[PDB]
C-alpha cells in the first residue's frame, strides 16, 4: 500500500492515469480489503 | 454458429443450478408500476408455463468504447467482445439500466438494475467481455 | 485497422489534428501500406 | 427468441385474434364480471 501511495501521489498532486488504473485493479480484486470493507464479510470499519 | 447482431430480441438467460438441478432463468421486468427486475424460472415449463411477455429485450445497437464516449460528450452491426450495447424492453419500451438504489442489504457494493424511461446517460449501456479463454 | 479506428475516434471530436497525431497517423499508415503490399505479393501471381 | 421471422407468417409470441370462418366473429371470452368469471370461450365477434 505504501508503494501504491508513492506511485499514485507525487508532489502533492494525484496522477490521474495511475490513480484510475490502481482503483480499477482494487475494485477488480475485492479480496484486497480483508475482513472490513469486504464484499462477502461486509464488516464495518468502525467495528473492525 | 450464428453471430449475435443488432436489431434482435434477447432473453438474457442464465443458469442457477440450485440443489444440483440446473434451473434456467431470465430477467423479467413489467416496467409499469415497478422498474426493478427479477429472475423468473424458465424451467419446469411442463408443470407451470412461465411468462415470457416481460422477458424480451430488443438490443438497440453495439458500439465501441471510444465512440460511446464521443457521443456521450456530444445502422446494423455485428456484436463482438469489448463493446457496449443498449437493451430496450419489448413491452415497456424503456431501456435497461443500472439503478443507484440498493435493495440488497447483504451487499453494500451491489446497486440495482432496472428499466429507465430514456437512454440518457451511460448507466443504461452495458459492455460485454469474453467469459471463456477460447 | 482497429488501432487506426480508435485513433480516428479519438481525433474525430477535435477540429484540427496536432503534430503528434499527424506523426502517429503517418507511422501507422506506412505500416499498413507495407502489410497490403505483402498480401498483394502473396497472391499477385495467380495462386489459387 | 426470434432471430428470423418470415413476413406474413405466424410466429410464436404473437398476440392475435382467431376470427371464425364467418369472418364476422372471433374466438373470445366473457364480457365483464360474468357469472362464469370469464372462463367460457365463445364465438361472439362483432363489437369485441
Beta strands in B42-99 (DSSP E): 57-63, 84-89, 95-99
The answer to whether C41 is a known ligand-binding residue is yes
Kindly identify which residue of chain B lies nearest to residue D14, measuring between CA atoms.
B53
Which residues, in sequence order, are CB contacts of C32 under 8 Å at separation 6+?
C1, C4
Chains that touch B (3 or more CB pairs under 8 A): A, C, D
* CA–CA dist B111, B98 (Å, integer): 7
Tell me the structure's resolution in angstroms, rounded to a single decimal: 3.3
Contact in structure between B57 and B89 (CB atoms under 8 Å): yes
B105 vs A: CB within 8 A: no
Q: From B61, B65, B97, B95, select the one nearest B79 (Cα to Cα).
A: B61
B79 vs D: CB within 8 A: no
Long-range contacts of the stretch C29-37 (C-beta < 8 A, 24+): C29/C4, C32/C1, C32/C4
Distances in whole angstroms, Cα of residue B80 to Cα of each of B8, B18, B28, B68, D28 = 15, 31, 25, 15, 46
Cβ separation D1–B56 shorter than 8 A: yes
Query: Helix-strand-coil percent breakdown of chain D, rounded to 5?
Result: 0, 10, 90
Beta strands in chain D (DSSP E): none
B108 vs A: CB within 8 A: yes
Chain C residues in contact with B81 (beta carbon < 8 A): none
Contact map slice: A 9-38 vs B, CB within 8 A: 30
Contact map slice: D 1-48 vs B, CB within 8 A: 1-3, 13
Tell me, rounded to whole angstroms, the distance of Cα D22 from its chain centroid: 14
Read off the DSSP letter of residue B90: T
Cβ separation D1–B9 shorter than 8 A: yes
Kindly identify which residue of chain B lies nearest to residue C2, measuring between CA atoms.
B64
* CA–CA dist B125, B83 (Å, integer): 10
Write the burial class of residue D43 (CB in 10 Å: 0-12 exposed, 13-18 middle, 19+ buried): middle
B71 vs C: CB within 8 A: no
* CA–CA dist B14, B78 (Å, integer): 22
Smallest Cα distance from B82 to chain C, Å: 12
Amino acid at each position: 500500500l505504501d508503494f501504491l501511495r508513492f506511485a499514485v501521489f507525487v508532489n502533492g498532486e494525484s496522477v490521474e492515469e495511475n490513480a484510475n488504473v490502481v482503483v480499477r485493479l482494487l475494485i477488480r480484486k475485492p479480496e484486497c480489503f480483508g475482513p472490513a470493507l469486504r464484499g462477502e464479510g461486509g464488516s464495518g470499519l468502525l467495528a473492525a | 454458429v450464428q453471430f449475435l447482431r443488432t436489431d434482435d430480441e434477447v432473453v438474457l438467460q442464465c443458469s442457477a443450478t440450485v440443489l444440483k438441478e440446473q434451473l434456467k432463468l431470465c430477467l423479467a421486468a413489467e416496467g409499469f408500476g415497478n422498474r426493478l427486475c427479477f429472475l423468473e424460472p424458465t424451467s419446469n415449463a411442463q408443470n407451470v408455463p412461465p411468462d415470457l411477455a416481460i422477458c424480451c429485450f430488443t438490443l438497440e445497437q453495439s458500439l465501441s468504447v471510444r465512440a460511446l464516449q464521443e457521443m456521450l460528450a456530444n445502422g446494423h452491426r455485428t456484436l463482438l467482445y469489448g463493446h457496449a450495447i443498449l437493451l430496450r424492453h419489448a413491452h415497456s419500451r424503456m431501456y435497461l439500466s443500472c439503478l443507484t438504489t440498493s435493495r440488497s442489504m447483504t451487499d453494500k457494493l451491489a446497486f440495482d438494475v432496472g428499466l429507465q424511461e430514456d437512454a440518457t446517460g451511460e448507466a443504461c449501456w452495458w459492455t460485454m467481455h469474453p467469459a471463456s479463454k477460447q | 485497422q482497429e488501432s487506426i479506428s480508435d485513433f480516428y475516434w479519438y481525433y474525430s471530436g477535435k477540429d484540427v489534428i496536432e503534430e503528434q497525431g499527424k506523426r502517429n497517423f503517418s507511422k501507422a499508415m506506412s505500416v499498413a501500406k507495407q502489410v497490403f503490399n505483402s498480401l498483394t505479393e502473396y497472391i499477385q501471381g495467380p495462386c489459387t | 427468441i426470434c432471430s428470423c421471422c418470415e413476413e406474413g407468417y405466424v410466429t410464436g409470441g404473437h398476440v392475435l385474434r382467431l376470427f371464425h370462418g364467418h369472418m364476422d366473429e372471433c374466438l373470445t371470452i366473457s364480457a365483464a364480471d360474468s357469472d362464469d368469471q370469464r372462463r367460457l370461450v365463445y364465438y361472439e365477434g362483432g363489437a369485441v
